Structure 1
Amino acid sequence: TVVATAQEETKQAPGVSIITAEDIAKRPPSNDLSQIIRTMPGVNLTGNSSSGQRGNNRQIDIRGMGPENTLILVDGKPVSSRNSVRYGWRGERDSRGDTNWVPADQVERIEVIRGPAAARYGNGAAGGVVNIITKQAGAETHGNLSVYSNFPQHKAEGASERMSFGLNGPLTENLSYRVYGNIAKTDSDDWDINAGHESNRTGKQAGTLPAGREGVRNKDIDGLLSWRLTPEQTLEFEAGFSRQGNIYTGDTQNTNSNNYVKQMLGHETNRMYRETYSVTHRGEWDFGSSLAYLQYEKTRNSRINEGLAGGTEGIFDPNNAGFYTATLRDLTAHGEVNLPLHLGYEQTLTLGSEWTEQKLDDPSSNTQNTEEGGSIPGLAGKNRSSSSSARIFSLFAEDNIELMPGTMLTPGLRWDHHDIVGDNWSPSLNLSHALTERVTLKAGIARAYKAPNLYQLNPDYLLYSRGQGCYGQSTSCYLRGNDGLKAETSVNKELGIEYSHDGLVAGLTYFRNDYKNKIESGLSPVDHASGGKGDYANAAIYQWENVPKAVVEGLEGTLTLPLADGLKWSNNLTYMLQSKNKETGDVLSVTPRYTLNSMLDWQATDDLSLQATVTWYGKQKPKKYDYHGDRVTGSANDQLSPYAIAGLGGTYRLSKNLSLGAGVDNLFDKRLFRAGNAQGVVGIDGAGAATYNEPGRTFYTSLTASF
């Protein structure tokens, strides 16, 4: 009886969680799937950057590794769209992330793959992988129509509404389709949600506010045709078109303001179009199995002009009104075969390759001139190229070996060639061992890989500061892209033991990542520019640089008890032991010290299902040091205290064809307000860890019609 693939076997590793379509129906998200993905152990909902900048745009972070290290897939194929949004000095991006491209109600399941089992997915999988799997066609035609709406207690918070539909099944005998569409709106929080809560602001900056959450408008449609060519051979064509337009509520990099900002409150100021085309060929043959695919993803990011420095740094530029478009083109090709091998040991060999190209055209990002800080040899002050690109060819070999009943060994090797950075080697080993019929011991260790992003790699990408931003000094500097960077790598390990029997589950996992060569803004000048104006002349030139060592470490626990026949109590716990940049001694990603998610699920009748949830978060602590590397003082030290969020909801099945849902999130109305960024600037104190809004009590209803 044949052994599963490497890819399939390692989905049982300690660092993997699965969220089902039924889980999504019972705990419906407002809009972005991050709202449910974040409730898995070892997962956090975090700002992109430890600076706090754009800190209400929280995203899925795995094991404290930061959202940039979460690789998002849809049906196994990569999402790159956030790479069209400029990556700044502090790793900030004015991006909502990549977990909102698929509507929740057309999702079959979600694989959350954390740590060593994720390394095999290659570039970007150092934190882990989130693979969003869409519902597919079956034998008969089926379909659905799903609506969701919510209702905040406090009018300052944005309400969401959402309507989607699927239809799939045969068209002819050889030919079947699957299509879905979706329309959604999450309103923005109000411009003044955080008035009463903001960091102290003086002088010019009196009256300024940190913004609440940005709104979004989604239109998605997808079409897939599946064509059964030979008995061995299916060919699938799929095109997807998504648009997200924002609803602006005053976010700016440093939380300053001007009239162009005040004028755009409530309007669309950024729009993302994502176009996807894929062809997928599946074979079922005598020898085993094959899969190949080609995806082209085109992302257009159009938004209002902002400055890179000066008075218009990270804010709409009133002297260059209007919008620009950055374009990202990402082509991914993949092939593999899966070979059951019967001699010696039972095992299943996977052999494959992948090629990717990323092209970025960004006409706002490479425009910093050198007139103030002085000129930089090899860098033209003006008219630098918009474009950047990189290609990675990959080879891999994996084998899933049943050493003997109850024991599996799963070695793999990936090799990657990046046409600028060079070669990478990602060795992989995961295993499971049955200690008794009820208890299993599992371990993993691997080296994940992440290539530099195209901003960090580009010598034409140049940022400038008069002093505030410069590490180890107070005079003016430049930060320049560096096309000799190393790749980041992370040796990620876990050890897990788990009791499992009769739907009772008790489990504990320890994890640690030794994160190598994380790419960050440099700490020492490599050089000095020459000329410029006044005190600012002859600016220091820093580069994007590899940090030698960082570490995350902690524990994930799970406890699921069957209290009675229709009644199940599920809990998971994550405890962060470390998240440290070992060069700066500072925090890598600001996450709660612990997160405990608890759910009581009651099948009250055949037709009626009720749920209660509570989540407890521990303390959050900000960066110790400012951009200079000096000890932060004052309110920039502020920490968030522990807090809990509770909810209640249910589903009532009116028939095979109609179900309704209702409930309340954050039942005791526990709210937090964004006070600012972590550290301050001239006129505006920092706010430490108080960098985000936690919404209050919010009621919701849903209806799903299906056949």
Structure 2
Amino acid sequence: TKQAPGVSIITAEDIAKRPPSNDLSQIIRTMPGVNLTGNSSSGQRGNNRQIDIRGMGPENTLILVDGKPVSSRNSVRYGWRGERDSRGDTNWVPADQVERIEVIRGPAAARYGNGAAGGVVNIITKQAGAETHGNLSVYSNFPQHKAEGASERMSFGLNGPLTENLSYRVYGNIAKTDSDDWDINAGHESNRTGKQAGTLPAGREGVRNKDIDGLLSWRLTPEQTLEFEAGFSRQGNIYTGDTQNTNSNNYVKQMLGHETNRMYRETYSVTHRGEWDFGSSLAYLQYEKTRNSRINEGLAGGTEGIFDPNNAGFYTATLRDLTAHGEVNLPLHLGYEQTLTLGSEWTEQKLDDPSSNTQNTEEGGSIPGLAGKNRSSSSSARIFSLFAEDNIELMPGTMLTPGLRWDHHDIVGDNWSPSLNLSHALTERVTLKAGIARAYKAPNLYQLNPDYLLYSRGQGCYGQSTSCYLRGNDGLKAETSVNKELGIEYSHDGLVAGLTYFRNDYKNKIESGLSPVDHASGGKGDYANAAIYQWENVPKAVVEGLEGTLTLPLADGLKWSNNLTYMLQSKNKETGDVLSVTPRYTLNSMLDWQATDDLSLQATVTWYGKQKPKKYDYHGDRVTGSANDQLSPYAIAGLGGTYRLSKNLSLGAGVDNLFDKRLFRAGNAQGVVGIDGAGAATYNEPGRTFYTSLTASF
């Protein structure tokens, strides 16, 4: 089945029956335990939501492609409120070249180490066969309301042998998601007065994709395979007025409808795969090089994350991420029947960011140990990792899986991430699963860097109205989380019913500090001698909730599927405010009718629970008026079909949001001067949208 406790598979067949507009987040987010949220609670960059596992935030969701990490978003400035102006890393592989997606949540994900505290999403590509196969896939949607951006997508794939011990697969994708109109949120915006009169919270950013992957597999012996692949991808946006605080200037408006960020992603990988008597071997080298070219932004207060008109033009942030991995797998025949897995991992993240480290000290006064001008652009961290998994069959149908992961971070120090995963046949139809692991989060290179410096004149300073600096802190501890889960599942003749309780106890969550550690000296007027805060480790936070699934075969041709997320608790135990904003629950419901040998029909509903905003502003004071606004529970319904014309040609057509339930970004969560808050109303929900698709394949 596609749902066990803690784990979800999405197949190629699922991707075809609920086609995504462009980004995979659309379908990945319908799994149990998965939400589409920002990383903290500000609502900043709120139309740029990313996959979130069990409310742990999307920085704790590790994205792999064919088991190789994607780190491209680590090239985008990490802001005061824990958001990046990033669309995330689930849009690098085109939907129709994906074989399957694996979602691994909680204690079962800890063993993947750094940034798996939420879980792992592994996007797996279609491979060459015994003969040559290929496909040509085209998808095109059509919103009811013209304001909302339509999406168009064309991908091929082409694979096969070249010799009897040489395979290849290649694909290429060209896609575009038009931006929402600059004015989609007009009449829905928060109250905006004085200097900020006329300002708008933005709709969805558009994106243009160009993806090209080539792979050669070479099985130079019976039990010895060697893979080389290169990836070239490029996303350029279509700008539609988005700024961190929803403030505006002239440069912003000049750029409406233009490309204001381009991400070039280049991946080369060498992968050796081994299979013999004693067991199985795997090792890879990945070089990921990300170029994040975008218009210079300010780094101070309300100018944080708006185009800087004094320093017009593009800069380029460069991320060179180097990953090498070794594992073996040993079948052991002892007192207890078991399989042992032994691994090292080595990673290097080099970040060149010529823009983020340029905030100067002329106004808030100078900071002992921090040069005001021409600070380094450079950040790096190396983690070295050893791990062993023992997959022990006590008595058939029972597995006990203990593993130790140890990591040496060359700044933060040593991490010990132990794990234990039990699965228990109570009956041939029923399985109990328990897991308790301590997962691992290395600070990102922004949090870690004493050259990385934000400034506010007060509005953004915790527990005061005076000027303050926020500073990077190489003294930080890693974030660790003891992810507990207890779950039960009945599964028989395609009848599946399961419910999991999960609690992650979250230690040292890194976050903009609450107490000044220091005060700068000098500067201008009432702003002089500003307070200095760092990125602090929050001692304790907790997330808690329920994952459910229920699958009933109504008749032979008819399948009724349901996935449930229910989020019980999400609490920074220091401030008592929420970590993210999720829907209280999410129920995704598919009816799948195989009407004929050739015609398949799909009805879907998603129910979203209530969504409540943070209680406290940047000051730590209680928010008031429209900053308290909640989003009422709502549902989105859809019909679709796929009519197979032959073995070589299939056609799809359907409607997302049948009943045209629409939501509009009113702005960020809290009030600032001249821009009232928008509470939980921080994203655009698209209206009725027709779509059509065509797949030709040998």
TM range (shorter): over 0.9
* Contact persistence 2:419–2:437 (CA under 8 A): yes
1:385 Cα offset (Å): 0.2
* Contact persistence 1:11–1:117 (CA under 8 A): no
* Contact persistence 1:290–1:336 (CA under 8 A): yes
* Contact persistence 1:509–1:556 (CA under 8 A): yes
1:584 Cα offset (Å): 0.8
1:11 Cα offset (Å): 10
* Contact persistence 2:2–2:10 (CA under 8 A): no
In 2, distance between residues paired with 1:652 and 1:12?
Answer: 27
Q: 2:526 aligns with which of 520, 531, 535?
A: 535
In 2, distance between residues paired with 1:101 and 1:232?
Answer: 32
* Contact persistence 2:301–2:459 (CA under 8 A): no
In 1, distance between residues paired with 2:296 and 2:396?
Answer: 62
1:344 Cα offset (Å): 1.4
1:259 Cα offset (Å): 1.1
In 1, distance between residues paired with 2:388 and 2:106?
Answer: 19
* Contact persistence 1:11–1:113 (CA under 8 A): no
Q: Secondary structure at the match of 1:417?
A: strand
Q: Secondary structure at the match of 2:109?
A: helix
1:13 Cα offset (Å): 5.4
* Contact persistence 1:651–1:662 (CA under 8 A): yes
Deviations 1:118-153 (A, max 9, x none): 000000000111000001111000010100000000
1:228 Cα offset (Å): 1.2
1:357 Cα offset (Å): 0.4
Partner of 1:5 in structure 2? none
* Contact persistence 2:237–2:261 (CA under 8 A): yes
1:286 Cα offset (Å): 1.4
1:684 Cα offset (Å): 0.6
1:493 Cα offset (Å): 1.1
1:172 Cα offset (Å): 1.3
Q: Secondary structure at the match of 1:25?
A: helix
1:12 Cα offset (Å): 7.8
Deviations 1:66-93 (A, max 9, x none): 1111110000000000000000100111
Q: 1:55 to 1:316 in 2, by over 3 A?
A: same
* Contact persistence 1:49–1:90 (CA under 8 A): yes
1:310 Cα offset (Å): 5.7
1:202 Cα offset (Å): 0.3
In 2, distance between residues paired with 1:378 and 1:320?
Answer: 26
1:51 Cα offset (Å): 0.2
Query: Counterparts in 2 of 1:112-511, with a 5 A limit?
Result: 112-309=103-300, 312-511=303-502
Q: Secondary structure at the match of 1:538?
A: coil
Q: Secondary structure at the match of 1:302?
A: strand
* Contact persistence 1:49–1:55 (CA under 8 A): no
Q: How many residues align?
A: 698
Q: Secondary structure at the match of 2:215?
A: strand
Tell me, which stretches of 5 or more residues in structure 2 are unaligned?
none
Q: 1:500 to 1:13 in 2, by over 3 A?
A: closer
1:203 Cα offset (Å): 1.0
TM-score (norm 2): 0.99
Deviations 1:147-179 (A, max 9, x none): 000000000000000000100010111211000
Q: What CA RMSD, in Å, does the superposition of the two structures yield over aligned residues?
A: 1.0
1:509 Cα offset (Å): 0.6
Q: Secondary structure at the match of 1:319?
A: helix
In 1, distance between residues paired with 2:338 and 2:397?
Answer: 13
* Contact persistence 1:560–1:569 (CA under 8 A): yes
* Contact persistence 2:3–2:9 (CA under 8 A): no
Partner of 1:653 in structure 2? 644
1:258 Cα offset (Å): 1.1
* Contact persistence 1:646–1:668 (CA under 8 A): yes
In 1, distance between residues paired with 2:641 and 2:31?
Answer: 20
Q: Secondary structure at the match of 2:26?
A: helix
Q: 2:22 aligns with which of 31, 40, 55?
A: 31
1:312 Cα offset (Å): 3.5
1:48 Cα offset (Å): 3.0
Q: Secondary structure at the match of 2:662?
A: coil
Q: 1:267 to 1:661 in 2, by over 3 A?
A: same
In 2, distance between residues paired with 1:210 and 1:13?
Answer: 40
Q: 1:632 to 1:312 in 2, by over 3 A?
A: closer
* Contact persistence 2:4–2:489 (CA under 8 A): no
* Contact persistence 2:623–2:671 (CA under 8 A): no
In 1, distance between residues paired with 2:588 and 2:446?
Answer: 37
In 1, distance between residues paired with 2:289 and 2:542?
Answer: 35
In 2, distance between residues paired with 1:351 and 1:393?
Answer: 14
1:338 Cα offset (Å): 0.5
1:311 Cα offset (Å): 6.3
In 1, distance between residues paired with 2:120 and 2:259?
Answer: 31
* Contact persistence 1:13–1:117 (CA under 8 A): no
In 1, distance between residues paired with 2:63 and 2:540?
Answer: 25
* Contact persistence 1:13–1:430 (CA under 8 A): no
Deviations 1:610-641 (A, max 9, x none): 00000100000000000000001110000000
Q: 1:673 aligns with which of 649, 657, 664?
A: 664
TM-score (norm 1): 0.98
Deviations 1:513-549 (A, max 9, x none): 0011000000001011111111111111001000011
1:602 Cα offset (Å): 0.2
* Contact persistence 1:48–1:57 (CA under 8 A): no
1:204 Cα offset (Å): 1.2
Q: 1:97 aligns with which of 71, 83, 88?
A: 88
In 1, distance between residues paired with 2:172 and 2:432?
Answer: 43
* Contact persistence 2:245–2:302 (CA under 8 A): no
1:47 Cα offset (Å): 2.1
1:317 Cα offset (Å): 1.5
Q: 1:293 to 1:484 in 2, by over 3 A?
A: same
Tell me, which stretches of 5 or more residues in structure 1 are unaligned?
1-9
In 1, distance between residues paired with 2:681 and 2:611?
Answer: 9
Q: Secondary structure at the match of 2:507?
A: strand
In 2, distance between residues paired with 1:13 and 1:569?
Answer: 17
In 1, distance between residues paired with 2:416 and 2:628?
Answer: 40
1:437 Cα offset (Å): 1.1
In 1, distance between residues paired with 2:138 and 2:565?
Answer: 33
Deviations 1:545-580 (A, max 9, x none): 000111000111111100001000001211111001
Q: 1:12 to 1:42 in 2, by over 3 A?
A: closer
Deviations 1:20-73 (A, max 9, x none): 000000100000000000001111111233100000001101111111111100
What is the identity percentage for the equivalent residue pairs of Structure 1 and Structure 2?
100
